[PDB]
Structure formats: C-alpha cells, structure tokens
Curated annotation (Swiss-Prot):
Name by which UniProt lists this protein: Lymphocyte function-associated antigen 3
One GO cellular component term noted in the UniProt record for this chain: cell surface
Domain Ig-like: 2-93
Functional summary from the UniProt entry: Ligand of the T-lymphocyte CD2 glycoprotein. This interaction is important in mediating thymocyte interactions with thymic epithelial cells, antigen-independent and -dependent interactions of T-lymphocytes with target cells and antigen-presenting cells and the T-lymphocyte rosetting with erythrocytes. In addition, the LFA-3/CD2 interaction may prime response by both the CD2+ and LFA-3+ cells.
Oligomer and partners: Interacts with CD2. Interacts with CMTM6.
Keywords assigned: Cell membrane, Disulfide bond, Glycoprotein, Immunoglobulin domain, Membrane, Signal, Transmembrane, Transmembrane helix
Residues modified by glycosylation: 12, 66, 81
BP GO annotations: cell-cell adhesion; cellular response to tumor necrosis factor; cellular response to type II interferon; heterotypic cell-cell adhesion; immune response; positive regulation of interleukin-8 production
Molecular function in Gene Ontology: signaling receptor binding
Domain of life: Eukaryota
Length: 95
C-alpha cells in the first residue's frame, strides 16, 4: 500500500521504508522527475534536491529539507530488495 506524509514549508520530513533488509540500492522519484538514488554505497540526488535532501543509508528512508509548495506531490521509491515500488505522498503546509 501507499503512505502519506505531513510536511511544512521551510521544514523537514522523512519517508520511512519498510525494508526488512538494509536497502543497498534505493531510488526515490517525484512525479515525472527524479529526487534521489542510492547505489554502490554512494548516495546522490538529482537536479538540486541534493542540496535539500537527506537520504538514509540503512532502510532507504528519504528525508527532505526545506519544503515548498511544489514539494506537495506524490513521491515514489524503488529498490531491488523492495517488492516493487512504493508511493509516499507528501503534503506541504504552512504550520
């Protein structure tokens, strides 16, 4: 199933992943774009998210930083160990 998260402009949020096994290769996406991607023990974001993201190196959980009105979108993660792919919805609020 999917999950929704509650965020706030200029705030932080984390997208927990039920990965029984340490996610070695994770890939987070946002709509028709790319957010972050973990592989070869190396984490890296896309576009300019790298300067506003904090992807974990264990469960593959992703922690965004400094949210905006555009951050309020349905994110989707992908992992080899994962069953297929999850969709963690993000909601940006004022407070």
């Amino acid at each position: 199933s999917s999950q929704q998260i509650y965020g706030v402009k200029y705030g932080n949020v984390t997208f927990h992943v039920p990965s029984n096994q340490p996610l070695k290769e994770v890939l987070w996406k946002k709509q028709k774009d790319k957010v972050a991607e973990l592989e070869n023990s190396e984490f890296r974001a896309f576009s300019s998210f790298k300067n506003r993201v904090y992807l974990d190196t264990k469960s593959g959980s992703l922690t965004i930083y400094n949210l905006t009105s555009s951050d309020e979108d349905e994110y989707e993660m992908e992992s080899p160990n994962i069953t297929d792919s999850m969709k963690f919805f993000l909601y940006v609020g004022e407070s």
